[PDB]
Design a protein around this ligand. Structure first.
Ligand code: FES
Ligand SMILES: [K+]
Ligand SMILES: [K+]
Ligand SMILES: [K+]
Ligand SMILES: [Mg+2]
Ligand SMILES: [Zn+2]
Lengths: 119, 77, 53, 168, 86, 54, 295, 193
RNA sequence: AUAGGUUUGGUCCUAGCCUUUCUAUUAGCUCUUAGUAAGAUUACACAUGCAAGCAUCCCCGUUCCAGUGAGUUCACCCUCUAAAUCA
């Protein structure tokens, strides 16, 4: 299906069943459906911890590099996975989100302490 | 999803979206991170583009490729 | 394999492109703004709240 | 039984036993052979047995046959460059003719192995998808990973129906 | 059917009868035993020293039904159905 | 510096090829000139609103 | 200076190859699997001997001994420690590089822990992930229960040692702890109950001999070889023992006495062999019987 | 009924009663399914015992209450596996209902996992051609300068308080739409006592 | 297909029809629970609500996704070469 413009993108295609998500890393045209036609599969991402307490992520690094070199863009969830893997720098929003959580939890410790101290 | 021709909903006629409140300290720190992050990623992207182009050129007119082409011609003759 | 010509599809296409060149709106119409409601009367679209000031 | 003499020739097993895979230069192959004469027996056997095997392995090469045009049988190959390879096949057996053209115009076993290895890379074991293309359809098939809800129901805590109930 | 079955089974040639007629060893090749050559029958008389001529192309009459199945061209909803032990 | 993983993969290729060196791989970001987000864009390539009036 | 021979040395391979033996009936035992109608060929004696020779060639490939490797060292290398990510995630991420054309021992498999540490995957995780994405026939992701001490003792009671070795070879890697542990525990059971013939004419005999020689317990194997009229193999076993223990009483004894053939067994029997008395009695019985047949 | 062999199921197959009833033939030798036509249904009945009530023609396993399908009853399980090929007979072969065939299939696999039932274990080839553990992927990678000093990999991971002049620009640009300024974040993640 | 029933007073041959197997809709009667998958007969007519916004104005998007199967060798390969992505 020849689209008007568009570009290749490496993004997460949702699979699995209800309450059992499973993502396939695929390089697909920007305008194609999420779970529709793709150019090449570049890995997978199981977001549910397994028996060993691991979230398994497969990355065809040789083919990911090839497609980034051909002008393929990247979705935010895909950029955050490559940041955790050490293939790219940590996406700034993971740093900021981590800092926001630190501040929230620091504020939560005050009320808890006051209750135990005052009462 | 709606098409350009489909009419706008009546309930949304008066809807006005308000931008979120901006935190000065967080805003500036975040802006720099994007500037650095995108600079590093742009450098990486350039490196990957060069590798792809080199591999294609090597396959087309590489020394090993040309050597094989000459050997094939000699064998035929 | 011989495709049947679609003449009306090419006729209207030329007419449309032409009318887009003769009835094109001017910058005076496109970029006008009502300073009380802060909306472009050409399209009736509100400007972003950050641009109102 | 199967019709015709030597019905084995009309079997996929026999047609895939040809060892002559022409190089990409070969475009046309003209087989001139005589219907009678002891010196043309091999050429007649080569047309009877081996042309089906050659065409099966080289679907895009045109093979054209001419009967009783010359006193002796011969093969002529027309290459893409414009060169014409004349192979005289008089007195040779059908096995000798087949071995001869493999040497001068057939891809070696190394060239073929390489092409087959390139096909192996097309199917990646790690890729998941429909059985026509991939080994496994979902990660749930891999032991240790959370099984499919259809087989093993998920805990109530992990189900969206009750995730929002505990919260509200 | 009965008269035909007893006619065929009575006329089947044994491995020993084959070896004696051909004067050659009958070697059984089993896939479950790899390349191990199992000699099932040997000629009781003298053993020929000339190898049987190996014809390049066998001039044998093939049953279309057999060839059609080997090529996966035979679809039948009644074939290979689960049945009680016989 | 290269990110953690990419660095480890470039150092491994060096040792595999036989090159013995202790230099750190680093990305040359001098070529990448990061311009501000409010830099004037090219007006020649910018489109124009269509005629449909309200 | 003077390097002690390795398991893969041509000399050791020749000795261990001959010690194993080649029983074509055992190597190609009929397998209990899905069967097909056998084929038949009319063959001359010359042709029959050629096919038998080809079976010997194929059988020798099936008997190729696996290389003995030393236990792999645990991997404990940290690539980075991003302390900012501490506390953000509750589960660790395992990233596997599934690039097709890479040797499995050259693949980068890293783990992002909840603390933020990007570390290389342990040997166990590495093997588990390679099976998840490059599944091998006969290997399981979760360790089969057969390898428990109780379950492995049942397999031994049934004289199924070779099966335990094939199961181990498929599941575990040659340099893994579980791999070496099982082979070492199987070799011990063979020695205690004298079941050395179970592993003869198999690719696992060499490994069994290598284990016994390097632990100085070749007494039981020597007795069995003599009891079975395999002096040539028994003498080669004693010879090999000397090469892997040159600075030994038996090695010096043979050097001092220039012992050869049966003499090597006597020298080793008295000096180093733990069961020197039993060996002499066993060797004595054989030599007497051999003298009778010679007459 | 209450069979006395539930605890030691292998005993029944060695008792005199078993030899009188079955002898040397498999327990399913005499069973015949009742069905219309010459070709039987491709599935056997789901279960022979419904609500503690047995059907008219109970299957070989369900007709004898003393036959216990257990991974330890190796002699019983062997009767339901092909001696020449080692494949488990499908239910139509012997006539066992789907329920008992599922219990049999699991028990045969459990017995094979425990080593009680012999099965063909093939000889497999090694996974890797080379066994060297010298590649960086498995060896130790030289630590990066930042890792040795304990600094973040990139300097922009750490929070750097912006200058006061820059904070004034943002406070002019977003007049009336400003949040409380946030200082440097905690050095480590707190925890609820 | 491992086949079976059926022409006749009876036999053999040929032959059609049907039976036995496996699925999908609809109907009758009947029906306890949980998880999962799938789900108008009709390109007939449609009440009502919603399905495209974003953004310091310009642009960009609404040409996608979602839907249907009316029409029907526009889909595949090669050659050539626009637009688009690689700031
Ligand atoms: S198909 Fe994999 S979770 Fe359902
Ligand atoms: K009929
Ligand atoms: K119904
Ligand atoms: K249609
Ligand atoms: Mg262009
Ligand atoms: Zn039953």
């Amino acid at each position: 299906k020849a689209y008007r413009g568009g570009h290749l993108t490496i993004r997460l295609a949702l699979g699995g069943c209800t309450n059992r998500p499973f993502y396939r890393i695929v390089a697909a045209h920007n305008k194609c459906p999420r779970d529709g036609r793709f150019v090449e599969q570049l890995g997978s991402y199981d977001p549910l911890p397994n028996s060993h307490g691991e979230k398994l992520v497969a990355l065809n690094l040789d083919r990911i590099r090839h497609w980034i070199g051909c002008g393929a863009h990247l979705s935010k969830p895909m950029e955050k996975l490559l940041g955790l893997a050490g293939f790219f720098p940590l996406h700034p929003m993971m740093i900021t989100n981590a800092e926001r959580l630190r501040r929230k939890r620091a504020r939560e410790v005050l009320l808890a302490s006051q209750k135990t101290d005052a009462e | 999803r709606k098409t350009r021709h489909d009419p706008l909903a009546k309930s949304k006629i008066e809807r006005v979206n308000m931008p979120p409140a901006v935190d000065p300290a967080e805003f500036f720190v975040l802006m720099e991170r994007y500037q650095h992050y995108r600079q590093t990623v742009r450098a990486l992207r350039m490196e990957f583009v060069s590798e792809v182009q080199r591999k294609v050129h090597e396959a087309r007119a590489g020394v090993l490729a040309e050597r094989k082409a000459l050997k094939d011609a000699a064998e035929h003759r | 394999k011989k495709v049947r010509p679609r003449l009306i599809a090419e006729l209207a296409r030329r007419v449309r492109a032409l009318r887009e060149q003769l009835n094109r709106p001017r910058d005076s119409q496109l970029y006008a703004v009502d300073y009380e409601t802060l909306t472009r009367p050409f399209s009736g679209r509100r400007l972003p709240v950050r641009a109102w000031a | 039984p199967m019709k015709g003499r030597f019905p084995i020739r009309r079997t996929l097993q026999y047609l895939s036993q040809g060892n002559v895979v022409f190089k990409d230069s070969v475009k046309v192959m003209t087989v001139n052979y005589n219907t009678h004469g002891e010196l043309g027996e091999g050429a007649r056997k080569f047309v009877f047995f081996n042309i089906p095997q050659i065409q099966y392995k080289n679907p895009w090469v045109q093979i054209m046959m001419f009967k009783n045009m010359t006193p002796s049988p011969f093969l002529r190959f027309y290459l893409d460059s414009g060169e014409q390879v004349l192979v005289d096949v008089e007195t040779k057996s059908n096995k000798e003719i087949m071995e001869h053209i493999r040497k001068i115009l057939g891809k070696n076993e190394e060239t073929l192995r390489e092409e087959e290895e390139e096909k192996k890379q097309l199917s990646h074991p790690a890729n998941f998808g429909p059985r026509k293309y991939c080994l496994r359809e979902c990660i749930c098939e891999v032991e240790g990973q959370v099984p499919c809800p259809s087989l093993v129901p998920l805990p109530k805590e992990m189900r969206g129906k009750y995730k929002a109930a505990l919260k509200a | 059917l009965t008269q035909g079955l007893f006619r065929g089974l009575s006329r089947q040639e044994t491995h020993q009868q084959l070896a004696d007629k051909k004067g050659l060893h009958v070697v059984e090749i089993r896939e479950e035993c790899g390349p191990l050559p199992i000699v099932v029958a040997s000629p009781r008389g003298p053993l020929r020293k000339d190898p049987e001529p190996e014809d390049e192309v066998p001039d044998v009459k093939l049953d279309w039904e057999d060839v059609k199945t080997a090529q996966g061209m035979k679809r039948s909803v009644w074939s290979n159905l689960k049945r009680a032990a016989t | 510096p290269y990110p953690p993983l990419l660095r480890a993969m470039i150092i491994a290729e060096r040792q595999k090829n036989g090159d013995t060196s202790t230099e750190e791989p680093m990305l040359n970001v001098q070529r990448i000139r990061m311009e501000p987000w409010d830099y004037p864009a090219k007006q020649e390539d910018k489109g124009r609103a269509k005629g449909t009036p309200v | 200076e003077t390097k002690k021979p390795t398991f893969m040395d041509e000399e050791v391979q020749s000795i261990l190859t001959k010690m194993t033996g080649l029983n074509l009936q055992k190597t190609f035992k009929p397998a209990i699997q899905e069967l097909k109608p056998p084929t038949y060929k009319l063959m001359t004696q010359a042709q029959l001997e050629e096919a038998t020779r080809q079976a010997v060639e194929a059988a020798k490939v099936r008997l190729k001994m696996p290389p003995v490797l030393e236990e792999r060292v645990p991997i404990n290398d940290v690539l980075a420690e991003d302390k900012i990510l501490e506390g953000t995630e509750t589960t660790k991420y395992v990233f596997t590089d599934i690039s097709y054309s890479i040797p499995h021992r050259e693949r980068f498999i890293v783990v992002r822990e909840p603390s933020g540490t990007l570390r290389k995957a342990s040997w166990e995780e590495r093997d588990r992930m390679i099976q998840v994405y490059f599944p091998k026939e006969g290997r399981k992701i979760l360790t089969p229960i057969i390898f428990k001490e109780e379950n492995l003792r049942t397999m031994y009671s049934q004289d199924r040692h070779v099966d335990v070795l094939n199961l181990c070879f498929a599941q575990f890697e040659p340099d893994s702890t579980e791999y070496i542990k099982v082979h070492h525990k199987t070799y011990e059971d063979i020695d205690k109950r004298g079941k050395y013939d179970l592993l003869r004419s198999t690719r696992y005999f060499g490994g069994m001999v290598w284990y016994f020689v390097n632990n100085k317990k070749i007494d039981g194997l020597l007795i069995d070889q003599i009891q079975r009229d395999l002096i040539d193999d028994a003498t080669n076993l004693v010879q090999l023992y000397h090469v892997l223990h040159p600075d030994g009483q038996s090695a010096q004894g043979a050097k001092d006495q220039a012992a050869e053939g049966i003499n090597l067994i006597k020298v080793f029997a008295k000096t180093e062999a733990q069961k020197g008395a039993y060996i002499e009695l066993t060797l004595q019985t054989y030599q007497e019987a051999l003298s009778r047949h010679s007459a | 009924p209450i069979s006395p062999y539930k605890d030691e199921p292998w005993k029944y197959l060695e008792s005199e009663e078993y030899q009188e009833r079955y002898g040397s033939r498999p327990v399913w030798a005499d069973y015949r399914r009742n069905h219309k036509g010459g070709v039987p249904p491709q599935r056997t009945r789901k279960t022979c015992i419904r609500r503690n009530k047995v059907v008219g023609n109970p299957c070989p396993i369900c007709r004898d209450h003393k036959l216990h399908v257990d991974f330890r009853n190796v002699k019983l399980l062997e009767q339901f596996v092909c001696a020449h090929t080692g494949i488990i007979f499908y239910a139509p072969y012997t006539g066992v209902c789907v329920k008992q065939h599922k219990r049999l299939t699991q028990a045969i696999q459990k017995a094979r996992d425990h080593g009680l039932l012999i099965y063909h274990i093939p000889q497999v080839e090694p996974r890797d051609l080379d066994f060297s553990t010298s590649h960086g992927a498995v060896s130790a990678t030289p630590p990066a300068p930042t890792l040795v000093s304990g600094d973040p990999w990139y300097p922009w991971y750490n929070w750097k308080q912006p200058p006061e002049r820059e904070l004034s620009r943002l406070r002019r640009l977003y007049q009336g739409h400003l949040q409380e300024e946030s200082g440097p974040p905690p050095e480590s993640m707190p925890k609820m006592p």
